[PDB]
Amino acid sequence: GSMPKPGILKSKSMFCVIYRSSKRDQTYLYVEKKDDFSRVPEELMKGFGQPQLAMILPLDGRKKLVNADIEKVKQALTEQGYYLQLPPPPEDLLKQHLSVMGQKTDDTNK
């Protein structure tokens, strides 16, 4: 999942609505207004179900969120009209990547 090509370039600010999943980890839907979601696939909405109004994004230009990137939604409401944000799994990290002296020195030659 990356970027094959940009294309037309039209950056325009506006107002958006951030909905919250009735019961989920941290899923939120985005739309140019609180009207409805008809572009979302019934396969994904199955997890959302009945969205609710938990946060409204104003249209003054200063709109920054920590869940989804308002900029990644701009091309979603202008082309489709809706954008669902889903926080992916971070990671617990560990001690195995790369290789920094992970063995011992000198041993008992058998």
Short mmCIF file of N, CA, C and O in Angstrom, two decimals:
data_model
loop_
_atom_site.label_atom_id
_atom_site.label_comp_id
_atom_site.label_asym_id
_atom_site.label_seq_id
_atom_site.Cartn_x
_atom_site.Cartn_y
_atom_site.Cartn_z
N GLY A 1 0.86 -1.22 0.00
CA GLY A 1 0.00 0.00 0.00
C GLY A 1 0.88 1.25 0.00
O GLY A 1 1.38 1.67 1.02
N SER A 2 1.08 1.85 -1.14
CA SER A 2 1.93 3.07 -1.21
C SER A 2 1.29 4.11 -2.13
O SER A 2 0.08 4.25 -2.19
N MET A 3 2.09 4.85 -2.85
CA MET A 3 1.52 5.89 -3.77
C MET A 3 2.04 5.68 -5.20
O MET A 3 3.20 5.88 -5.47
N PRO A 4 1.15 5.27 -6.06
CA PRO A 4 1.51 5.03 -7.48
C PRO A 4 1.73 6.35 -8.21
O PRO A 4 2.67 6.51 -8.97
N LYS A 5 0.87 7.31 -7.99
CA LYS A 5 1.02 8.63 -8.67
C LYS A 5 -0.01 9.62 -8.13
O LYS A 5 -1.12 9.25 -7.80
N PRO A 6 0.39 10.86 -8.05
CA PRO A 6 -0.51 11.92 -7.54
C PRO A 6 -1.59 12.26 -8.58
O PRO A 6 -2.66 11.68 -8.58
N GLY A 7 -1.32 13.19 -9.45
CA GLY A 7 -2.33 13.56 -10.48
C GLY A 7 -2.76 15.01 -10.27
O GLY A 7 -1.99 15.84 -9.82
N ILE A 8 -3.99 15.33 -10.58
CA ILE A 8 -4.46 16.73 -10.39
C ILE A 8 -4.09 17.21 -8.99
O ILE A 8 -4.10 16.45 -8.04
N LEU A 9 -3.77 18.47 -8.84
CA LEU A 9 -3.40 18.99 -7.50
C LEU A 9 -4.33 20.13 -7.09
O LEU A 9 -4.19 21.25 -7.54
N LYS A 10 -5.29 19.85 -6.24
CA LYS A 10 -6.23 20.92 -5.81
C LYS A 10 -6.39 20.88 -4.28
O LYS A 10 -7.20 20.15 -3.75
N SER A 11 -5.63 21.67 -3.58
CA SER A 11 -5.74 21.69 -2.09
C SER A 11 -6.79 22.71 -1.65
O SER A 11 -6.64 23.90 -1.84
N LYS A 12 -7.86 22.25 -1.06
CA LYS A 12 -8.92 23.19 -0.60
C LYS A 12 -9.35 22.87 0.83
O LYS A 12 -9.62 21.73 1.16
N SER A 13 -9.42 23.85 1.68
CA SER A 13 -9.83 23.60 3.09
C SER A 13 -11.36 23.61 3.20
O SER A 13 -12.05 24.16 2.36
N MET A 14 -11.89 22.99 4.22
CA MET A 14 -13.38 22.96 4.37
C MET A 14 -13.77 22.42 5.75
O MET A 14 -12.96 22.36 6.65
N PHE A 15 -15.00 22.04 5.91
CA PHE A 15 -15.46 21.51 7.22
C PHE A 15 -15.69 19.99 7.12
O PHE A 15 -16.10 19.49 6.10
N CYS A 16 -15.40 19.27 8.17
CA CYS A 16 -15.59 17.79 8.13
C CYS A 16 -16.18 17.30 9.46
O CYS A 16 -16.09 17.96 10.47
N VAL A 17 -16.78 16.14 9.46
CA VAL A 17 -17.37 15.61 10.72
C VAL A 17 -16.67 14.30 11.12
O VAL A 17 -16.55 13.39 10.33
N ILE A 18 -16.19 14.21 12.33
CA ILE A 18 -15.50 12.97 12.77
C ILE A 18 -16.46 12.09 13.57
O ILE A 18 -16.81 12.40 14.69
N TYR A 19 -16.88 10.99 13.01
CA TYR A 19 -17.82 10.08 13.74
C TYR A 19 -17.04 9.04 14.54
O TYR A 19 -15.88 8.77 14.27
N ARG A 20 -17.66 8.44 15.52
CA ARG A 20 -16.95 7.41 16.32
C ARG A 20 -17.71 6.08 16.25
O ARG A 20 -18.92 6.04 16.24
N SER A 21 -17.00 4.99 16.19
CA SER A 21 -17.67 3.66 16.12
C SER A 21 -18.39 3.35 17.43
O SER A 21 -17.81 3.41 18.50
N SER A 22 -19.65 3.03 17.36
CA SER A 22 -20.42 2.73 18.60
C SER A 22 -19.62 1.80 19.52
O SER A 22 -19.60 1.97 20.72
N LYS A 23 -18.95 0.82 18.96
CA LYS A 23 -18.15 -0.11 19.81
C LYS A 23 -16.92 -0.61 19.06
O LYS A 23 -16.98 -1.57 18.32
N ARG A 24 -15.80 0.04 19.25
CA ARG A 24 -14.56 -0.40 18.55
C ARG A 24 -13.33 0.17 19.27
O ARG A 24 -13.46 0.97 20.18
N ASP A 25 -12.16 -0.22 18.87
CA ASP A 25 -10.93 0.31 19.54
C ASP A 25 -10.88 1.83 19.39
O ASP A 25 -11.12 2.57 20.32
N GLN A 26 -10.57 2.29 18.21
CA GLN A 26 -10.50 3.76 17.98
C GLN A 26 -10.80 4.07 16.52
O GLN A 26 -10.04 4.72 15.83
N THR A 27 -11.92 3.60 16.03
CA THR A 27 -12.28 3.85 14.60
C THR A 27 -13.14 5.12 14.48
O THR A 27 -14.02 5.36 15.28
N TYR A 28 -12.89 5.92 13.48
CA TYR A 28 -13.69 7.17 13.31
C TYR A 28 -13.96 7.42 11.82
O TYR A 28 -13.11 7.21 10.98
N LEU A 29 -15.13 7.89 11.50
CA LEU A 29 -15.46 8.17 10.07
C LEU A 29 -15.35 9.68 9.81
O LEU A 29 -15.49 10.49 10.70
N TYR A 30 -15.10 10.06 8.58
CA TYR A 30 -14.98 11.51 8.27
C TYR A 30 -15.84 11.88 7.07
O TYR A 30 -15.89 11.17 6.08
N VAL A 31 -16.52 13.00 7.13
CA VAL A 31 -17.39 13.42 5.99
C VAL A 31 -17.42 14.94 5.90
O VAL A 31 -17.19 15.65 6.86
N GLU A 32 -17.73 15.46 4.74
CA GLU A 32 -17.78 16.94 4.58
C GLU A 32 -18.92 17.51 5.43
O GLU A 32 -18.97 18.68 5.71
N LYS A 33 -19.84 16.67 5.84
CA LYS A 33 -20.97 17.16 6.68
C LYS A 33 -21.63 15.98 7.41
O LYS A 33 -21.38 14.83 7.11
N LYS A 34 -22.48 16.26 8.36
CA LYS A 34 -23.16 15.16 9.10
C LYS A 34 -24.41 14.70 8.34
O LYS A 34 -25.51 14.79 8.83
N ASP A 35 -24.24 14.22 7.13
CA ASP A 35 -25.43 13.77 6.36
C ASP A 35 -25.57 12.25 6.39
O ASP A 35 -26.44 11.71 7.05
N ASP A 36 -24.73 11.54 5.69
CA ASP A 36 -24.83 10.05 5.69
C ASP A 36 -23.59 9.42 5.07
O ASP A 36 -22.74 10.10 4.52
N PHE A 37 -23.49 8.13 5.14
CA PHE A 37 -22.31 7.42 4.55
C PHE A 37 -22.81 6.40 3.52
O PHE A 37 -23.26 5.33 3.86
N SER A 38 -22.73 6.74 2.26
CA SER A 38 -23.21 5.80 1.21
C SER A 38 -22.04 5.26 0.39
O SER A 38 -22.19 4.35 -0.40
N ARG A 39 -20.87 5.82 0.55
CA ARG A 39 -19.71 5.34 -0.24
C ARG A 39 -18.97 4.24 0.52
O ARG A 39 -18.24 3.45 -0.05
N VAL A 40 -19.14 4.18 1.81
CA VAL A 40 -18.45 3.13 2.60
C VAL A 40 -18.98 1.75 2.20
O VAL A 40 -20.17 1.55 2.07
N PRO A 41 -18.06 0.84 2.01
CA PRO A 41 -18.43 -0.54 1.62
C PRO A 41 -19.12 -1.27 2.78
O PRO A 41 -18.68 -1.20 3.91
N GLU A 42 -20.20 -1.95 2.50
CA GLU A 42 -20.92 -2.68 3.58
C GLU A 42 -20.00 -3.71 4.24
O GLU A 42 -20.30 -4.24 5.30
N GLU A 43 -18.89 -4.01 3.64
CA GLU A 43 -17.96 -5.01 4.24
C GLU A 43 -17.20 -4.37 5.41
O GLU A 43 -16.95 -5.01 6.42
N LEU A 44 -16.84 -3.13 5.28
CA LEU A 44 -16.10 -2.44 6.38
C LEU A 44 -17.09 -1.84 7.38
O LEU A 44 -16.97 -2.01 8.57
N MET A 45 -18.08 -1.14 6.89
CA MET A 45 -19.08 -0.53 7.81
C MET A 45 -19.57 -1.57 8.81
O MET A 45 -20.00 -1.25 9.91
N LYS A 46 -19.51 -2.83 8.45
CA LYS A 46 -19.97 -3.89 9.39
C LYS A 46 -19.32 -3.68 10.76
O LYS A 46 -19.93 -3.89 11.79
N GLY A 47 -18.09 -3.26 10.78
CA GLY A 47 -17.40 -3.03 12.08
C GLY A 47 -17.93 -1.73 12.70
O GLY A 47 -18.17 -1.65 13.89
N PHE A 48 -18.11 -0.72 11.90
CA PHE A 48 -18.63 0.57 12.44
C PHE A 48 -20.08 0.40 12.88
O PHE A 48 -20.42 0.61 14.03
N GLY A 49 -20.95 0.03 11.98
CA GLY A 49 -22.38 -0.16 12.34
C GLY A 49 -23.06 1.21 12.41
O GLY A 49 -23.31 1.85 11.41
N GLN A 50 -23.37 1.66 13.60
CA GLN A 50 -24.04 2.99 13.73
C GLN A 50 -23.03 4.03 14.24
O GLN A 50 -22.67 4.03 15.40
N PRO A 51 -22.62 4.88 13.34
CA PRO A 51 -21.64 5.94 13.69
C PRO A 51 -22.31 7.01 14.56
O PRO A 51 -23.52 7.15 14.58
N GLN A 52 -21.53 7.77 15.28
CA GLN A 52 -22.12 8.83 16.15
C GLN A 52 -21.30 10.12 16.04
O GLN A 52 -20.18 10.12 15.55
N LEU A 53 -21.84 11.22 16.49
CA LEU A 53 -21.09 12.50 16.40
C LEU A 53 -20.29 12.73 17.69
O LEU A 53 -20.81 13.17 18.69
N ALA A 54 -19.02 12.42 17.67
CA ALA A 54 -18.19 12.62 18.89
C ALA A 54 -17.28 13.85 18.73
O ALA A 54 -16.89 14.47 19.70
N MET A 55 -16.95 14.20 17.52
CA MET A 55 -16.07 15.39 17.30
C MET A 55 -16.36 16.02 15.94
O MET A 55 -16.44 15.35 14.93
N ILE A 56 -16.52 17.32 15.90
CA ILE A 56 -16.81 17.99 14.60
C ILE A 56 -15.60 18.82 14.16
O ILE A 56 -15.05 19.59 14.92
N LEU A 57 -15.18 18.66 12.93
CA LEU A 57 -14.01 19.44 12.44
C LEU A 57 -14.49 20.74 11.78
O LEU A 57 -15.24 20.71 10.82
N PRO A 58 -14.04 21.84 12.32
CA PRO A 58 -14.43 23.17 11.78
C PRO A 58 -13.76 23.43 10.43
O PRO A 58 -12.90 22.70 9.99
N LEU A 59 -14.17 24.48 9.76
CA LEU A 59 -13.57 24.80 8.43
C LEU A 59 -12.85 26.15 8.49
O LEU A 59 -13.16 27.07 7.75
N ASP A 60 -11.90 26.29 9.36
CA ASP A 60 -11.16 27.58 9.47
C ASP A 60 -9.72 27.42 8.97
O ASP A 60 -8.99 28.38 8.84
N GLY A 61 -9.31 26.21 8.70
CA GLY A 61 -7.92 25.99 8.21
C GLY A 61 -7.09 25.33 9.32
O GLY A 61 -6.20 24.55 9.05
N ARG A 62 -7.38 25.64 10.55
CA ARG A 62 -6.61 25.03 11.67
C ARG A 62 -7.32 23.77 12.17
O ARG A 62 -8.01 23.79 13.17
N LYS A 63 -7.15 22.67 11.48
CA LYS A 63 -7.81 21.41 11.91
C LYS A 63 -6.79 20.27 11.97
O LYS A 63 -6.45 19.68 10.97
N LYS A 64 -6.31 19.96 13.14
CA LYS A 64 -5.32 18.85 13.27
C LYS A 64 -5.83 17.78 14.23
O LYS A 64 -6.25 18.07 15.33
N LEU A 65 -5.80 16.54 13.82
CA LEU A 65 -6.29 15.45 14.70
C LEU A 65 -5.17 14.46 15.00
O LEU A 65 -4.17 14.41 14.30
N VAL A 66 -5.31 13.67 16.03
CA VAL A 66 -4.25 12.68 16.37
C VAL A 66 -4.66 11.29 15.89
O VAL A 66 -3.85 10.38 15.84
N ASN A 67 -5.90 11.10 15.55
CA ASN A 67 -6.36 9.76 15.08
C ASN A 67 -6.08 9.61 13.59
O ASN A 67 -5.35 8.73 13.17
N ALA A 68 -6.64 10.46 12.77
CA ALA A 68 -6.41 10.36 11.31
C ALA A 68 -5.85 11.68 10.77
O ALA A 68 -6.03 12.73 11.35
N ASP A 69 -5.16 11.63 9.66
CA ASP A 69 -4.58 12.87 9.09
C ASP A 69 -5.65 13.61 8.27
O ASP A 69 -6.05 13.16 7.21
N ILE A 70 -6.10 14.73 8.75
CA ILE A 70 -7.14 15.50 8.01
C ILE A 70 -6.74 15.66 6.54
O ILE A 70 -7.58 15.72 5.66
N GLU A 71 -5.47 15.74 6.26
CA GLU A 71 -5.02 15.91 4.85
C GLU A 71 -5.31 14.64 4.04
O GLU A 71 -5.70 14.71 2.89
N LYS A 72 -5.13 13.49 4.62
CA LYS A 72 -5.41 12.23 3.87
C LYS A 72 -6.91 12.10 3.62
O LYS A 72 -7.35 11.32 2.80
N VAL A 73 -7.70 12.85 4.34
CA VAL A 73 -9.18 12.77 4.15
C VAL A 73 -9.64 13.78 3.09
O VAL A 73 -10.65 13.60 2.45
N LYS A 74 -8.90 14.84 2.91
CA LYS A 74 -9.29 15.86 1.89
C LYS A 74 -9.61 15.18 0.56
O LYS A 74 -10.67 15.39 -0.02
N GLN A 75 -8.71 14.39 0.05
CA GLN A 75 -8.95 13.71 -1.25
C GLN A 75 -10.03 12.64 -1.11
O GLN A 75 -10.48 12.06 -2.08
N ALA A 76 -10.45 12.35 0.09
CA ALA A 76 -11.51 11.31 0.28
C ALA A 76 -12.90 11.94 0.21
O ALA A 76 -13.81 11.38 -0.36
N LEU A 77 -13.07 13.10 0.78
CA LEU A 77 -14.41 13.75 0.75
C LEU A 77 -14.62 14.48 -0.59
O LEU A 77 -15.73 14.70 -1.02
N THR A 78 -13.55 14.86 -1.24
CA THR A 78 -13.69 15.57 -2.54
C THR A 78 -13.95 14.56 -3.66
O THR A 78 -14.63 14.85 -4.63
N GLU A 79 -13.42 13.38 -3.54
CA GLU A 79 -13.64 12.35 -4.60
C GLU A 79 -14.81 11.44 -4.22
O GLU A 79 -15.73 11.24 -4.99
N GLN A 80 -14.79 10.90 -3.03
CA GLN A 80 -15.92 10.02 -2.59
C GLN A 80 -16.89 10.81 -1.73
O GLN A 80 -18.06 10.94 -2.04
N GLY A 81 -16.41 11.35 -0.64
CA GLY A 81 -17.30 12.14 0.26
C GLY A 81 -17.25 11.55 1.67
O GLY A 81 -17.93 12.01 2.57
N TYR A 82 -16.46 10.53 1.88
CA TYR A 82 -16.37 9.92 3.24
C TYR A 82 -15.00 9.28 3.44
O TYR A 82 -14.37 8.82 2.51
N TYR A 83 -14.52 9.27 4.66
CA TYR A 83 -13.18 8.66 4.92
C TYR A 83 -13.17 8.00 6.30
O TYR A 83 -13.47 8.63 7.30
N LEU A 84 -12.82 6.75 6.37
CA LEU A 84 -12.79 6.05 7.69
C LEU A 84 -11.35 5.93 8.19
O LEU A 84 -10.48 5.46 7.48
N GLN A 85 -11.10 6.36 9.39
CA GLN A 85 -9.71 6.27 9.93
C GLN A 85 -9.59 5.08 10.89
O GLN A 85 -10.40 4.89 11.78
N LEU A 86 -8.58 4.27 10.72
CA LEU A 86 -8.39 3.10 11.62
C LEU A 86 -6.94 3.05 12.11
O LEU A 86 -6.03 2.87 11.33
N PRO A 87 -6.77 3.22 13.40
CA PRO A 87 -5.42 3.19 14.00
C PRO A 87 -4.84 1.77 13.93
O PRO A 87 -5.35 0.86 14.55
N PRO A 88 -3.79 1.63 13.16
CA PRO A 88 -3.13 0.31 13.00
C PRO A 88 -2.35 -0.05 14.26
O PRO A 88 -2.16 0.76 15.14
N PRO A 89 -1.92 -1.29 14.31
CA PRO A 89 -1.14 -1.78 15.47
C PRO A 89 0.28 -1.22 15.43
O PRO A 89 0.94 -1.28 14.41
N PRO A 90 0.72 -0.70 16.54
CA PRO A 90 2.08 -0.13 16.63
C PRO A 90 3.12 -1.25 16.64
O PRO A 90 3.51 -1.75 15.60
N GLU A 91 3.58 -1.66 17.80
CA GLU A 91 4.60 -2.75 17.86
C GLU A 91 5.21 -2.82 19.27
O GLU A 91 5.35 -1.82 19.94
N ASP A 92 5.58 -3.99 19.71
CA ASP A 92 6.19 -4.12 21.06
C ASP A 92 7.72 -4.14 20.95
O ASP A 92 8.42 -4.14 21.93
N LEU A 93 8.23 -4.15 19.74
CA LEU A 93 9.71 -4.16 19.56
C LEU A 93 10.33 -5.32 20.35
O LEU A 93 9.66 -6.02 21.08
N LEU A 94 11.62 -5.51 20.20
CA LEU A 94 12.29 -6.62 20.95
C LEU A 94 13.80 -6.56 20.72
O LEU A 94 14.34 -5.57 20.28
N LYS A 95 14.50 -7.63 21.03
CA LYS A 95 15.97 -7.64 20.83
C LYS A 95 16.37 -8.72 19.82
O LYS A 95 16.97 -9.72 20.17
N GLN A 96 16.03 -8.54 18.58
CA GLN A 96 16.39 -9.57 17.56
C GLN A 96 16.75 -8.92 16.21
O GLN A 96 17.52 -9.46 15.45
N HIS A 97 16.20 -7.77 15.91
CA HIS A 97 16.53 -7.11 14.62
C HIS A 97 18.02 -6.78 14.54
O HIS A 97 18.69 -6.66 15.55
N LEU A 98 18.54 -6.62 13.35
CA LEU A 98 19.99 -6.29 13.21
C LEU A 98 20.84 -7.34 13.92
O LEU A 98 20.42 -8.46 14.14
N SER A 99 22.04 -6.99 14.29
CA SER A 99 22.93 -7.96 14.99
C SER A 99 24.07 -7.22 15.70
O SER A 99 25.06 -6.86 15.09
N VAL A 100 23.94 -6.99 16.97
CA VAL A 100 25.01 -6.27 17.71
C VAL A 100 25.63 -7.18 18.78
O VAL A 100 25.19 -7.21 19.91
N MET A 101 26.64 -7.92 18.42
CA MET A 101 27.29 -8.83 19.41
C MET A 101 26.22 -9.57 20.22
O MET A 101 25.96 -9.25 21.36
N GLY A 102 25.60 -10.56 19.64
CA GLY A 102 24.55 -11.33 20.38
C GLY A 102 25.07 -12.73 20.69
O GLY A 102 24.31 -13.66 20.87
N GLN A 103 26.36 -12.90 20.74
CA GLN A 103 26.93 -14.24 21.04
C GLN A 103 27.98 -14.13 22.15
O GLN A 103 28.18 -13.08 22.73
N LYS A 104 28.65 -15.21 22.46
CA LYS A 104 29.69 -15.16 23.53
C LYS A 104 31.09 -15.28 22.92
O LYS A 104 31.24 -15.58 21.76
N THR A 105 32.10 -15.05 23.71
CA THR A 105 33.49 -15.15 23.18
C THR A 105 34.27 -16.24 23.93
O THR A 105 34.09 -16.43 25.11
N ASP A 106 35.12 -16.95 23.25
CA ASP A 106 35.91 -18.02 23.92
C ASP A 106 34.97 -19.12 24.43
O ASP A 106 33.92 -18.85 24.99
N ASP A 107 35.33 -20.36 24.24
CA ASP A 107 34.46 -21.47 24.71
C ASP A 107 35.30 -22.70 25.07
O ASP A 107 36.51 -22.64 25.11
N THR A 108 34.67 -23.81 25.33
CA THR A 108 35.43 -25.04 25.68
C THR A 108 35.59 -25.93 24.45
O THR A 108 34.78 -26.80 24.19
N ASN A 109 36.63 -25.73 23.68
CA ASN A 109 36.84 -26.57 22.47
C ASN A 109 36.66 -28.05 22.81
O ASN A 109 37.46 -28.63 23.52
N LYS A 110 35.62 -28.66 22.32
CA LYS A 110 35.39 -30.10 22.62
C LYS A 110 36.18 -30.97 21.64
O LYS A 110 36.20 -30.64 20.46
#
